[PDB]
Every structure is written in C-alpha cells, then in structure tokens.
Design a protein around this ligand. Sequence first.
Ligand SMILES: O=C1CC(=O)NC(=O)N1
Ligand SMILES: O=C1CC(=O)NC(=O)N1
Ligand SMILES: O=C1CC(=O)NC(=O)N1
Ligand SMILES: O=C1CC(=O)NC(=O)N1
Ligand SMILES: [Ca+2]
Ligand SMILES: [Ca+2]
Ligand SMILES: [Ca+2]
Ligand SMILES: [Ca+2]
Lengths: 362, 363, 362, 362
Amino acid sequence: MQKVEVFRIPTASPDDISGLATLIDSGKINPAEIVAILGKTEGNGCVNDFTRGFATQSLAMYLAEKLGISREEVVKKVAFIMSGGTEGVMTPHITVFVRKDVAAPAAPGKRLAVGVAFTRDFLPEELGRMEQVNEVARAVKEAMKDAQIDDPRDVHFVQIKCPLLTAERIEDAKRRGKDVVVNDTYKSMAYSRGASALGVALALGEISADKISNEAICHDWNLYSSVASTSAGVELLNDEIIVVGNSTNSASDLVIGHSVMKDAIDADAVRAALKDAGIRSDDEMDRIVNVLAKAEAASSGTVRGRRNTMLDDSDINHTRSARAVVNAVIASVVGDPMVYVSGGAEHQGPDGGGPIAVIARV
Amino acid sequence: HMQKVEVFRIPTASPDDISGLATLIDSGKINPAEIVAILGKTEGNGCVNDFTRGFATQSLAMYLAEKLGISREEVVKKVAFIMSGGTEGVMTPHITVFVRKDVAAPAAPGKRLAVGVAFTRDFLPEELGRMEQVNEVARAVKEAMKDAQIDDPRDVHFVQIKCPLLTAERIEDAKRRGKDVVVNDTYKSMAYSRGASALGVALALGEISADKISNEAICHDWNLYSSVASTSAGVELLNDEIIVVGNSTNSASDLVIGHSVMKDAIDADAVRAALKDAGIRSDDEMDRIVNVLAKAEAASSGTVRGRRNTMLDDSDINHTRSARAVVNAVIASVVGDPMVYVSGGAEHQGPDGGGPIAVIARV
Amino acid sequence: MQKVEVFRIPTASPDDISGLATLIDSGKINPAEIVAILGKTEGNGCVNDFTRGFATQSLAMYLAEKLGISREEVVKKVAFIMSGGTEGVMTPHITVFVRKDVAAPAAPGKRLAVGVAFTRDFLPEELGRMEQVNEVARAVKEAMKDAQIDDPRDVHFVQIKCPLLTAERIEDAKRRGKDVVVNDTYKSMAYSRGASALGVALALGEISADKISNEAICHDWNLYSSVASTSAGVELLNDEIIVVGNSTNSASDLVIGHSVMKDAIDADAVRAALKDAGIRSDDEMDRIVNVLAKAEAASSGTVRGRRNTMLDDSDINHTRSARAVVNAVIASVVGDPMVYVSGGAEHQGPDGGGPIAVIARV
Amino acid sequence: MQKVEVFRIPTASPDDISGLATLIDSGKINPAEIVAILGKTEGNGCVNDFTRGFATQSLAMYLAEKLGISREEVVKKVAFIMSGGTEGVMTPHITVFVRKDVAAPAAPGKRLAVGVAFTRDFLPEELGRMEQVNEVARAVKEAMKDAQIDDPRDVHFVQIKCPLLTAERIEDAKRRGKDVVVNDTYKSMAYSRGASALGVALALGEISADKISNEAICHDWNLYSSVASTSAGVELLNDEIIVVGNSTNSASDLVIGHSVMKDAIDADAVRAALKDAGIRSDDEMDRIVNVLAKAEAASSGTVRGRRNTMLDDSDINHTRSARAVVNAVIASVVGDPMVYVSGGAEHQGPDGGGPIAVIARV
Ligand SMILES: O=C1CC(=O)NC(=O)N1
Ligand SMILES: O=C1CC(=O)NC(=O)N1
Ligand SMILES: O=C1CC(=O)NC(=O)N1
Ligand SMILES: O=C1CC(=O)NC(=O)N1
Ligand SMILES: [Ca+2]
Ligand SMILES: [Ca+2]
Ligand SMILES: [Ca+2]
Ligand SMILES: [Ca+2]
C-alpha cells in the first residue's frame, strides 16, 4: 500500500527552498520520502535558461543537508523536472511528490499513484531518434509498474525531462563520424521532446510500433500521446520519467484526471480535465492541488482560422507565447495562475494542442 | 436624415494590408465617404519603437485618398485612425471600420449603436500627462457625444482615444523653451498620456468629480478611473483622437454595444457580463459578436489574486506585451475567437490591474 | 560616360524623407536620376521588421509625387533596398545613388559605376534553392552591363534584397503540395541570403557552376563570394541587385574599394578596405562617403578561440548581435557610427566574416 | 609586503568552476588566498538575471568544500562580484584575485595592490540616495587601507556590486509607508549604480561633499568618478567594493593603469589605458591579464552627433546594447573579446563614457 501526497509551493526565486523548508520543519513532509519535484522556474524556458540548473542545484543542496547525503546522491534518488518559462501571469512554483507506503485498507475505487524511472545516458546522435523512443518507452513501463498501475488507461500524465544538443555534443558526435538529428540546439529541444513523447505513446498502447520511424519524429503530427508531457533542458544527458495515474492499490487522498486541449484556447478541455478528476462545480475548485498542461504554437500559424504572429515574431520565441496563452486560459477557468504549463508539445496532443491533467483532493 | 452605424471587423495580413477594406468597398457594402473611424491592431511591439502604427495609418490614408479623389492630408483631417500596436499571444491583427450612414428610415425602437468622433488641439510636450491634456480631452469627449446624439452619459459604453507620447526631440524642444515635461522617459510618457486622457473621459462623463483630479493625482491615485475609457499612445500624432461609442434613441443601427470592467487580467466573469450587456445571453448567440474591445495591464502589486508573476521584473519582455497576450487569451477562450481588440496600459482605465471591456453585437 | 554621385543622408525615422527632399529642393539631386536607395532602418532586421516596407513606401510615394508618375512606376524604375536592424550605436540613414549621363573627358583610371537589375518574383519553394541562385546570377550579369563594367575584378560590392518565408507563405506552399527549403521563418532568411550570394559568386566567376547545388546552400561555408552583400525582407517577393564597381567609362569623382573581414573584430580588414579606396591615412577619413559591410555569428560559436553566446541566446537573434558588433568595430576605426552594416553573411566572406566596401571621393 | 596574482579563466556556463579547480589542483592558486572573484555571466545583466547568483552559489559551494568551511563564511571572506550580460562577442569568464603576504625585498616602482570591503545592508528606500553614497564612500576608504594605498591617485579601478529594486521590494516599501527612489525595477539599477559611483568619487576626493545631494544623483552628469565601475544585482542587499591600484608595499609582478573612454567608440582611450599599464606596442599585448571597462548609452541618444536607438528600443534594454558595443571596440584593439565590460555608467566617466582599466604583467 503506497500513499501519495502532492504539495504545490510558491517560490520567490529559482533558488527559493523556504516553502519546502517550512513543510519539512513542520513534519508535514518527511524529506526521505520525496520521489519527485516538478518545477516552473522563471528563466526564458528556452536554450539559455540557467534557472533550471540553478533551481535543481539549490534544491539538491538543501535535501543533501536534511538527508545527510551528497548532492550527487540526492540527484540519483529524486527526479528533478525543472521547466523554465513563466510568461504572462504564470506564477513560479514547484510541485513536490511524496510517496509514503503505509499499511491501511485501500481506498475503494482508485487513488493517486506515482512512479519514477530514469533512462540510460543517450549518445548525442541518439537524441531525437528511435533509440530515444525505444529507451524512453522502456523506462515508462518500469516507472508504470513502480506506481502499481497495470492498465495503461489508469495513466493520466507522464512528465519527462529530456536532454538537448549543445555545441559540444555536436562535436562530441562529429569526431566519431555520427550526424545528429538537427544542428540547431533550440531545434533539438523539439526533437528531444518529440522523440520522448513517442516513447510514452509506444509504451501506453496509443500508437503501434510500425508507424514510428526516424522520418515520423516531428513530422507525422497524426502520431501523439494524450498524457505525455516532456520538457527539455541542458543540465543532463538522459531522460527522467514520472508516471502519474490512478491505482486500486493506493491509499491516496487525491486523484488525477486529464483531457486534451484541441488548441491553445480550449477552455472546454480545461473543464473536462477538471470533471474527469472529481471537480464539477466552481465551488469545488478549492480541491485542486495543481494543473499541468502542454502548450504550443500550431504549425499552421492560425488558431480557429485566425492568424497570429507566434511563428513570425523574431523578438519573442513562440514557446514563450504559447506558455503565456495556455496558462492565462487555465487561470481564467480555475481563478488561479499558479499552474504548471510547459511549451513545445511535439507529439503531445494534436498539432497546436496538448494534454492537460488535474490533481485534485477526493 | 437618420444615422445608421455599421461596423466591419476585417482580418489583416500585414500592417499595410488594405485588401479586406477594398473588398467591402468594391462590393458596395462600404461607401468610403461614410467612414468615420478605423480602429486597428497592428503587429508591431505596441511600445515606443512600433512603426507598424504609422505604417498602417499611412497605408489606409493613401488608399482612401485614392478612392475619394482627395489628398491624404484631407483624409487624415476627416477620419480617425487609431492604430494600437502589439498582437502578442494568439491575438489576430485586424482593423475595425466604423461607417456612419445617413439613411431614409426611422430610428429603430429602443437604443441602437451610435458613434461620434472629435479631435483635440495639438499638445505641447509639457502638457502631456497633465491637466491641460485632461481638460482638453474632456471637452472633446463632450463634442463626440453630441456628434453621436447621445444625451445620457450612461449610454456611453466605450471611449477610444489615440494619444501622443514624448520623444527625445519633443522633450528637448520643451527644455529649450524653459519648460519641464511630466517624465524624462519616452516609455513612461505613454503611461502618463494614456492616464491623463482616461481621466478626461471620466471627467467628461461624470464618473469622477472635477475637484478630485489634479497633476499630482495623474498616474498616482489609482482609485480614480473611467469604466469605459480605452486609450493608446503612439508617436504619430500630437493631439488626441476620440471615438465615443454608445447607444442612442435616435439610431437606425442593427447593432448595440455593452460593456463591463475586468477587475483583473483573468476576469472571465467580466467578459461574460459584457456579452450579456450587449444582448448575447448564451453560447449560441456568440455569433452575433462584431468585436470585443478591452484594456489590459500589469497590476502594480506585481500579483494576480495573490499569485506572483514576473511581468514587472522581466527585462527581456515589456509588461504591456505580456498583459495583452494574457487578456486576449482570456477573451479568446470565452468567445472562441482570438481576433479581438486588446490594448495594454490601463492607467485610470478600470481598477489597478483591470480595464474596461466593451462588446459590439448584432441585434 | 556615366557619372555617379552618392549621398549618405541621416534619417529621423523609417518614413523620414526630409533629408532627401532637402537635397532635391536645393538642386543637388535631380530626382529623375536616382537609380537606387540603400537604407538602414530601425526595425529589428528580422522576419517581422516592417520598417523596411514603411521606408520604401514613403520614398516611393515621395518620388512619385516629385516626378509626376505612379508609385508602381517608381518601384519598377528605382531599386529600394532597406536593411533593417540598427543595433548598438548604428545610425539609421539612407544612401542615395544618382547616375547622370555626361559628356566629359576620359577620366584617368577607373571611377565609381553602378548598375541595377531585378529578378522575377519567386515562389516560396524556390527560395534557398538553385532557381534563386540561377536567376540572381542572370540579374547580376545584367547589372554589370548596366554599370558598363566588363571585368568582374572591377566589381567591389553587390548588394541584394531578397525575400523570406512567413508562416502564411509556407502554408500556401503546403496547400499546393510543395516543400519549402526550411520550416523556420527566421532561418528562411539565411537560405534566401545564402542562395542570392552564391548567385553573385556564380555570375562573377568566383565559383564555378559545378560546385553549386541545393545541398551546398547554407552547408558548404567554404563556398563564398568576396563582394556579395545580401539582405532579406518580408516586403518583396523578388531579388533586387545593385552592382557597385569602377570602370574606365565613368566620370565619377568617387571610387570604391573593398576587403573581406575575416571575423567580427577584424579592424585590420576595415583599414585595408579604406586603403583600397584610396584613404591612405587617418587624416584622409573625411573622404569617406559610406562604409558597407556584412556581419555574422561564426558557426563555431567562437571568435579567435573565445566563446560567445550569439548562437545560444534565445532572447536576441544572432544577426542583431553581429550587426551591433561590426558596426561598433567599423565606427571605432572611422570615427562615425553612421555606416551600413547588414547581418547574416551566408556564403558572403568566410564563415564568421564578410565583405566590407568603402566608397570614397578621390 | 603584499603580493597579488590575477587569473582570467574562461567559463563554459555560469556554474563552471573547472578552470578555477584546475589552477587549484595544479598548485598555482592556494584557495585560501583568494580575496575576490570578478565575473562576467551569460544572463541578461538586467533585473531578472539569475546567472549572477547561480555562479556565486557554485563558486561559494566549491571553495567551501576546498577550504573545509561553510558557504556562509566563504561569502563573508571573499568578494563575489558577478556582472551579468555577455552580449556581442563578449566571452564569459571569471577574474580571480589571489593575495598573500610575503617576506620579499623592496621592489622599486609601485605594483598591483587590491583591497576589499563590504557595506551594511540597505533598505529598499535607501538605494539611490545619500545613505548609499555615504556608506559606499566609507567602505571605499576602508578597502584602500586594506590595499595599503594611501594616495587616491594610485587607485585605478573601484569595482562595486550593489542592489536593485524588484516589484516585490517596491510593493513592500509601500506597505511599510516608505517611497523608493524610482518605481521601475530596471531604472533602479541606474540609481544604485550611480549612488555607489558617487560614493567612490566622494571617497577618493574626486568630488567634494557639498556637490552631492539626493537631487544630483542620476541628474548632474558633470559629477562622476574616473575609476568607479558599479554593477547592480538582484541577489544581494549590500555593496561589495574591490579597490585596485598600485602600492609601493607591493611585490606583485603586475601593474594596473587606466583611462576614460569619452564615448562608446573611443578606441584612443583603450590604447591610452594600455599605455598607462606599460603596454607600449602591439607586440606587448601578450602581457594583458584583463581589461575592465564601463559602457553606456549617452543620455542624448547620440554618439558624435549620430543618432542611435539604444534608448528607444523597447525590445532590447540599452545596457545590453552598450556592453556589446564597448566589448567589440576593446576586442578590436586588443584582439580578444574575453574582457570585462559592464553596462550603465551613471557618474562613472562622463555622460556616454566610462572608466577603462588594464591589468598587465610588468
Ligand atoms: O516549457 C518548457 C519546454 C522545454 O522544452 N524546456 C523548458 O525549460 N520549459
Ligand atoms: O499605449 C498603447 C497601448 C497598446 O497596447 N499599443 C500601442 O500602440 N499604444
Ligand atoms: O541585417 C539584415 C539582414 C537581413 O537579412 N535583412 C535585413 O533587413 N537586415
Ligand atoms: O553590466 C552590468 C550592469 C549591472 O548593473 N548589473 C549586471 O549584472 N551587469
Ligand atoms: Ca501537440
Ligand atoms: Ca486599470
Ligand atoms: Ca561569411
Ligand atoms: Ca558615464
């Protein structure tokens, strides 16, 4: 019997650990049982965002202190998914997943259950290709069993921190005779997010294996997962995977539902995600623990037949604008901008859309 | 002689695109001699160095001068051109064209859409953001109301103004004449100009008493504001251009206008209340929308409903750009259409962090 | 016998025609003899820079009124090449080229000569490909003929305006079943700049045709022109060519010389360009009419072994940075930041460098 | 008899300490003798730049484990001044100041000396006002004695890290009923830079006290220090001062010289600074250890009467542009873009100019 608790903590800066320090000193959280931390940090969420690593370093230093272990050890034990980009009204915050297995009669029905798994370090020429998909698809199966979920349909969200291609990993693949998927480091964020997402779909039964190839990755937008949520960063060379869903063998005081935004202003999907997780009135909104969603600019350059400038705007990266938009739309349904939104939804929802999950109190 | 107002919301492909307007003129839907105002969203950055505003105005004036057989300057003396740059997020560039026909039909029963237009005099740089701007806008608002044949200020639902800003050259002109300007910063001057103009609206409509407004109150006392004023700064004029929109009992328009006030940037309730005030009482009637017109801003607390955001601390992206993307996305998500007018910088336009929102709808 | 006069005119804004009208009203410029105007305008110099079209519309409208002809006839007759982006201390300005027929003695030696030619409009799928190369090369030859220059060694600068891709144009292409050269609007500027530059190298014999193919464009940086200077813009669908050199059939009181900057801080190359124009001492800098240069971020991410973030900065596009840098370097050598610097030097000088030309009074 | 050594070390990211550690592992740096680290970090150098604190955290975390002590005591013992913003070709790097007492002979001539001092913490309502000026001026006199410099004319550079105002800090001052010096986060950096620079002028006797008042700060540009170089940051409440000059009680093999750039393209002042540091020809450039300069946009919006858009550009803040410009000018003179340039030179050199120092081997 594993129980899961989730703490959404406001943060004053990327290195702010006080909110997690207040819940530990109070005993509401025992640090030894922390399995993952999902963060929105206030850099630009693109290539040169060092708030990701700053936030992970600051958290790792704090937990190594309170657990008496080394920073490197904490990194191997706890999944740090730091997603940069807090545009518009999006509030910086972290979500701390605690997994405490306690003996107790199991909640009839199904309750929140979380699994984590790491993949091996990829080679740069394996970034954004079938070997990233297959490897990620494997680790998702192992994280899914570590959560005590057997049916791939009890899964409602799969977060992933994935690597990207830097100038050194290009040369660290060129002098071995290997070409990389793309030359632009920014473009490799799309290829890393996308290949990782096709891994979720492959292991969850959403898309058959015959369809997936090198040429499909970031090209056949008909292929996509409905629960995958991948975020790239420079501070790593493997993929870290968090599987969230519902399990009969769970005692959590929480459930997780989801839906899929058809486009960036699909407030209907926000409300359906809310209803899939036991929130059906505007008064029950106070049971939200967090809302987690993908955003992206549609490749057509339109939303509902209306042109926008996201793909033409040379001043502001289109992932920055997508995040601002989708956060604002979710904020306006739940009346709270402190919700996880991440940009670049390659193979995560249809082109121009992305999955959205709500974790709510029962 | 009976005023009929027709409003056309026209998507644009670029700042200089006149093809949608020309299609309506070529089909006979719009007589170009009856155009009184054009309200634009142009795809520049909406801040200091936004030249899409002047580009779109020059393009529209050139085109209409050619259709009308008159000079560009004559067109600009006769037609309000209000271009608000900044189409961030999913916001769709477009123009809204106000046409005032004189028809041979009685006024429609009840009150219907009416529009009036008035220009102030040119302002010296040392008048921007001070009482001379406030009082001059107030007089011009009153003139536009009479233009519109609206007698009751409560029948005014949206006042759109283009206002000037301070450039380095204008500031230097004022210093050479011995005068100081309200602020020594072009970007900040947009706020004072927007703010003074909004207070002229409030003064003219009686939303605020005259003895509450003074130089020191401007862009400081946020308790003072208009609930219908929407003001936008640009480098391209030295005066204010005023469009008063409301409903008159002497109108044959097939349209009406309603409004509410957003209390903050994610106030979807205020969008629905403005829709209802314009007669749209359900999702299926949303197809009667002609346009939605809203003001957006970064609250001075640096928060929304107690949640911190980075708008006021973000040195890479100006906060008025963020406010526009946010409020446009919030409206897009209620009405299902991102091609709506949203303008940033809501000083004395609704509460701190909020702004007026109007809806023009078919009856 | 042609005589060319060049006027460098500071501007207060993209639509500022007052400096030009003052020279027309004073009798210094016969507007009917203007053959080209080359501008630095204060937009961002990228995809969504509309100051370029604003400037061209304002100049075309002004000249059309002064000549009693239509705007369309002005643009068919005069080359308008507006290069956006006035970063750092670079000063917005236009350079106006006037060409007059004169009966004058055989000016000893060779003197400034200018030729103009336009290509047909391109379809979006032809940008960055051999169709563009080949059509630009044909236009370059016509421009040389227009300039009465027979020897390609007497050509010192070839300025081109060329189109780019927007989201809307890429969708038009797809809807016709065509694949564009790259799906990135920003990167489309580099393909269009690079293909135009190879068109110059092909026409001048700097590179033989059998070395140029679609796969070489924006990949083989060892193919380049030493005099090409190309600039992309949303405001036109063809290429406009200005060829600038010296010919024995010219009565100009000006000459043009050039060099190639090897990297973004190559002040040595600025001084060689000056010497090549006859400016043999610091006391003779007053004969400068204008300096014209290309700037770019090197693909290696480095300058003389030193790393910079130009290729990694998701907040500022690297062509903005490169323009700021090269303008600052030239400015510090000639004492004047009002010089023409354009960014993105694909196939224009070596990787990380670009041509630099000086127009000087003899 | 003090001995100062200085090490300019390239960095690969804001948290890169491997260059420093290589010098420590090799025996060339005793980590216990480091008194100051001056860095350029690749954030945006403005308000929301977290690379400054990321770098400081990493270095403090590294030195502490090296010396066996806590972080709190490393930051109390070593001055960390991280200046963000590496635009243009400016290369990220840190400059490490090692100082140790020696029993050496009296070396004729004066030689590099370094002193350090910290001020008390400032309330938000004190930045940009006389409390900051006078407390900085007191700490400058203390750093001078720590450097064993008793003649202000032997001070060549005074580097300062100072605070700034965020929205949250401004809103807190309101709650407490206190008004701040300006209600703009970005503009608050200028006031804090400027009050600190005036602190240096007052301490060195460059400006007499009766000239300084709250009204003069960031208004009277005739008031300035010729050696002050100040840099604001979101990650501290006080000011840290490094005084760099020459002392007869020095056994350093280095010297420092300086000059004042009269504007952003004043290459003549770079060469004067080099010549004042004993570098008399181009063949002696190899003796440069580092160049340190302040850059800024002039309040007139011009350079030598030529307009630029640094103060007009709502997409790029003017300190970003100034740093790119001045770094490129210095790089073109010395052949190396890995030099320290900092933006915003309020009361540091004349309006539009700033001090520039050179540390060189004798
Ligand atoms: O939203 C996102 C997407 C990503 O790829 N990396 C980030 O840091 N934030
Ligand atoms: O002041 C304003 C507000 C806006 O949103 N766009 C503009 O061009 N001016
Ligand atoms: O610097 C440049 C390069 C370009 O491609 N197009 C422009 O307008 N400016
Ligand atoms: O150059 C600078 C100036 C400043 O004030 N703060 C920074 O981080 N960098
Ligand atoms: Ca998608
Ligand atoms: Ca307001
Ligand atoms: Ca090149
Ligand atoms: Ca200065």
